[PDB]
């Protein structure tokens, strides 16, 4: 009966379609333009021709990891401790796992993160005298234009906090009062608060189907004694690596913006 | 996986396995033979002999390559490929020593180093490159040992077989049958190791012997130094040899002054 | 008056028929038989060829650092190309000539497999022409040429240039005419090198099979270890399909015969293929 | 004086008669035995070969239109021509020379069978005359000629030109005189290429049977796969008939001897037959 | 001093007699046995050869009038000539040497046969002299002579010229001295053509038997199918008779030994024989 | 750092021993087996050879004085010389290394037999050196040298000079080098006389066996009828004796090894032996 | 010390005697065996040979005069000659050396038979000297020599000239030195005509056995049909008689050993023998 020493919210990784691969890099097809010309046709008449543009895209596999040097003795003395450290690095890694999935520079090392792919928020949607929550509501609607049902919201914890505590001109909580509160949800959608999301920034889309995460090697932990001089110093190097790749089937289905102030 | 040519050097030489640091044999050095006609009731000539213990050490040849741990998993059979490729790359440099070993320190006593110099006065006016090799074979006789083989740079040997009389006909083989590597009833091994313009001839079949201490192997480590922390994989390919040189007089090295 | 012609009884006589059509010159298909063949399913092929082998394995002293050798690789791609042609014939003709169809097929597969050979030998890479042998092929070493060399002297030189990559030369490809002018070589004295007037010589040179094909343009020659150097990838075997519903064929009482095939040429070691030009 | 002179006693002595006539040189009949033979029962022949094969087959881009190819066929006809000749002779001479009748025939079957070759080799093709080999035969490619070649080289070139149609050459035909000078060729040293003075060489060049006949004009030569390239079709075998009632004959005490033959030469593949001229 | 000199006892010694006269070398008579032989009993011979054959055999159009051929015949004759000679000898000698007459026979019978070949070869033809082979023989075709030919090249050419008659040659006749210098031919390298010094050298050239006879004048030569080209007809065999009553012999105590023979040379095919002269 | 050098673990590792000793190149002894080998038991040899045969045999005139001939003789002597050498070693070495004892014998017998062969060929003839072949040998005749002759010709010339003694040649003695240079003779074209690069030639010349020995000085050669020309007489065969008492060998713990042989070379016919030089 | 020096103890050792004498080169006799042999009983020979045969046999016209022929004969003489020589010896020597007498016989019979051969070939013919082959021999013809001829060519010519006699050649006689220098003939390329250096050339040329004898002077050569051109008549065989009472031999204790022979050389046909000189 081992007990987990971390958090219990929703991971961006959960909001995505997970899959396993074996290839070094993945090549797929991103649907571009869909010129739909379907119409009514009389008998003995010619029919409409629709068109579908396509673009060949490639998602490279990147690797994330870290290690720790420990005293060989200490480890053999406290068996339970080692198991703990292992189950700790998995979390410590999963945090920076999101960091990439969110703001992937798309460079030689970084991945092509969501924020880099997402369509910018439409400003003309903003009304008069409407809060921050209103903006997100507009974003959810802006997703519909991609012909995809929005599912998921990513905000900086500090921001998401103040948002949940919005009041009107009288003092009433915009959200469900303390009494009837449930969990991290909004507009009937899952909310993922992460320090990865920069303050003032936000992301919304139908992640559950827009983009999918491809796993090459599941996050694991390996240990070595003969690593370098670990042997002559009586050390134990613990490794925690994981290699994956992120694909993007629809950039339109994702949106990111900024809270004006 | 590249294919090899017809068996080389190693085959020309005597092969034998060992299990020691080095080899020690005894060769006769100077036989001061003063045997002569003797006048009656006079003092007879005094002859003498000199011996020496020559030692041939066991050297080690190897090289390694470190590849990305991921690269290996993304392509399984690659492993098997590099292995069969390092064995080759090594076995090539192996001959390199056997031919041009410096003998100094680490380097082995290569044939060309130990080999007795070629005689220039043997070259006559207007001789083919083949006439020279013919001369060499004779010089080998000055040791009382039959010539065993010839070693030439592939290109040189190539231009040799393509010789022709002042008529136009080919000497070795008329432009049909594959010209077999044979000169004056002697096997000819063309190796890149032998630099162009240079050549070697001798009674290899019993002039020198190659002693294998350890056969060529391929070992792979995952924890070598950084490796594990750099997600690297080290492939190793080593071999332990020992080259002996019984008769140095039965080996000639020269240069085509063409 | 009663001759054998139009004006008279000639109409009464029936010219004897010679059952069986006369199939013309059938060039012997080669080249493809010289390469490795294998079926595929994808429209493209990603392979790799050893580019540079920086081997520097030396002797190592005891307790010393060993040499680090390195290997360079070049990721290559072989795209699948399509070759074909069609024929539009009258539906009547087909019904009035039984075995005709069976003929046309065998007669198209030929015309098709012909351009196939023409591609493999002289590709291009650009457009749709596959990266043919000659295109990829490493150039000949002019330095090898000496003085007073024959044409056969050169091929001998070329064969050595193949050994550079380390691979036995599998065959030689020459234009029939050049090959011909070779078999008829005479020494500075007058007699023939190969067969003499007594008899013709077999298609063998320097112990290697000689492949003379109209495919190889005159003045050019190719040598290498084809059976290893490059492999052909068969996506779709050469097949013949026929449709009467095609275009307006149904309303015109017509048939459209199609003969197609999908290939893809992959090159493993260009270093093992030499191409050159006979100096006239 | 009683000499053997006419004006003395020569009258009494009668010269001895030598039985038998001195038939001139009998040329060896070839060609016919060379070509394929078969008999018919009609006045002409009809066969069909492929003429134009427009093969526009090629590589095709994606979504593109394919190359259209077309084929052409033609009905080639070979008519049955007739050859003959007659000889009028006095009935007196016929009765006073028994063995003669049976003789004339032998000298006619030959005379006719001789002009048979005359056609088969140089058939004018003009209306009545048969379309002989030379008229049909594809001309020799002058380009094949190299610099400083013997006559033997030329023939070697010829044979190759046959291969340029995918057909194995059968035999060679040259005027004896030309063939002679060839057999007597010698290298720059002085030795004979074919047969050393001790004995004459056999009739074989480049592994092919050589047929020397006065039928072939000097400076001209023919090569090809005769054994199959063309076929002689017999309608009526050579026959000899005699009539004493033939028109005027009877009243003038004459005898008319006739001899005829019905043939038809077919030329299936002309691409496999070459004819050229030596550079005198 | 009793020696064996003329003026001493030498008179007592009688030299030893060696039985048998030393007869000179006898030329191997060939020509005679080379041709066809057969005897007669008349004065001359008459045979007949097809003079001129007018071969008009040709392709005939239907309903047309056929070509007419004609033949000519000529009667050629061959006379019987007489060869002989006599030796007038004293009756004294004849009786004092019994075996002499017996000897003279084997010396006259031969002596005649020697002059027999003489006519047979270089028969003047004019008057009584038989029309020998050379006179009848067809002249050599100077046109055949090419540049850089040897003496052997010519004889080879000659043999071909015989084929123009349509008859294969069977023999060659040259003056031994000329033939000799032929067997000793060398290539531009010095080596012998017929046989290296060690070896002999059979009397065979170009597959034909060579016949060297001092009868054939130097510089001249002859080739043909002799055994079928001509026949020698013997009227009366060689005979030897002796008369003492001849002329004034009875009163001079003498004899006259005669030796006569009657021949008749028939030349059937003058076309199958060729005479020439080494232009050098 | 635990190394394998003397400083660390070098001691622990025992180098692998190689059984036996490496004897230098043993020159193949010839000459001795080239002559007649007979037994003896005296200090010297005596025989007699006809020196001068003044043959004046001639034609005689009747009753006259006949010619007077005369003969001359001489006694030739052949002394018995002695060859030997010794080596003294520590009795300790001998007892410690068994093999050495028997080894030295095989090295002294040969070491002697060599200087023996060296004597037989170039025996100074002075003092104790026996009169060797080359000294006794008759000088080559320069007159035989013709312009443009190869070294192989000169040898052939020598053989003839041997025949001048009515005795046939037995063998040829050449310095390995000179012989080698000969085997590599080329004709004016470029080919080899014996050679033919594919295979090396045997040691035979003009039917005579060739003997290349380093004993023969460079530029010098010998030819004759050795087997019947000269004879080697053995008084005492090669033997090896040892003694611990040879002089102070006792009080020094030494061991003296001796090896001697007694010979006598007889030269019967010097006229059948030749020696000369080449152009240097 | 006690050495083997003459002035010490060597006087006690007796040199081993080699039994027998070393007889010089016994030159092989030839000539005599070539010619036919038969004994006589007289002192001279008489035989006759047909000298001039005037053969006028020709063709005779009818009832005309015949040709008169004529023959001539001449008596040929062949005188017998004697050859001998004696050697005076001491009575003492003869008794002190047993086998010596026997030796002399075998050394005299030879010495004589040697000058016998010398006569037969180079017989002066003048006075007592026999008329040897060379004197009789019909002079070699000069015109037979053509431009660019070897020495072997000349001998080939000689053989032919012998044929003009109508007789086969039996052998060839040359001075060994000339023959030898001939076997070493090289073509314009440097190859040996007879036998390549490897092989041994046989004593045969132009199919005829060659006989090299010192008897034949250098530069001279003889060819013919010796086996029946000349016969040697033995009157008295070679014998050896010895007397003590000869002259003063008895009072000086001497023995005169004699060796004589009586021969007679006959030359039947000189026309079958040729002698000449090499133009060197």
From Swiss-Prot, chains C, D, E, F, G:
Site of covalent link Isoaspartyl lysine isopeptide (Asn-Lys) (interchain with K-169): 253
Subcellular location: Virion
Transmembrane feature ranges: none
Superkingdom of this protein's organism: Viruses
Stated consequence of mutating residue 253 to D: Loss of cleavage and cross-linking
Result of altering residue 259 to S: No loss in the ability to form cross-links
Protein name: Major capsid protein
């Amino acid at each position: 009966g081992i007990i987990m020493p971390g958090l219990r919210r929703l991971t961006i990784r959960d909001l995505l379609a997970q899959g396993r691969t074996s290839s070094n890099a993945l090549e797929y097809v991103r649907e571009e333009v869909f010129t739909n010309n379907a119409d009514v046709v009389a008998e003995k008449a010619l029919k409409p021709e629709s068109d579908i543009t396509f673009s060949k895209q490639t998602a490279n596999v990147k690797t994330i990891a870290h290690w720790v040097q420990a005293s060989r003795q200490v480890m053999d003395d406290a068996p339970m401790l080692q198991s703990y450290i292992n189950n700790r690095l998995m979390y410590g890694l999963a945090l920076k796992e999101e960091g990439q999935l969110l703001n992937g520079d798309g460079t030689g090392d970084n991945l092509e993160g969501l924020n880099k792919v997402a369509t910018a928020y439409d400003t003309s949607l903003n009304a008069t005298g409407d809060t921050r929550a209103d903006i997100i509501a507009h974003a959810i609607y802006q997703v519909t234009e991609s012909e995809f049902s929005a599912s998921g919201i990513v905000l900086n914890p500090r921001d998401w906090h103040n948002i949940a505590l919005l009041k009107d001109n009288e003092g009433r909580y915009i959200f469900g009062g303390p009494q009837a509160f449930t969990s991290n949800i909004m507009w009937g959608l899952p909310v993922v608060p992460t320090k990865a999301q920069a303050a003032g920034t936000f992301t919304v889309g139908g992640f559950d189907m827009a983009s999918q995460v491809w796993d090459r090697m599941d996050a694991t932990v390996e240990v070595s004694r003969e690593d370098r001089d670990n042997f002559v110093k009586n050390m134990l190097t613990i490794l925690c690596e994981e290699r994956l790749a992120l694909a993007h089937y629809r950039p339109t289905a994702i949106i990111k913006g900024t809270f004006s102030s």
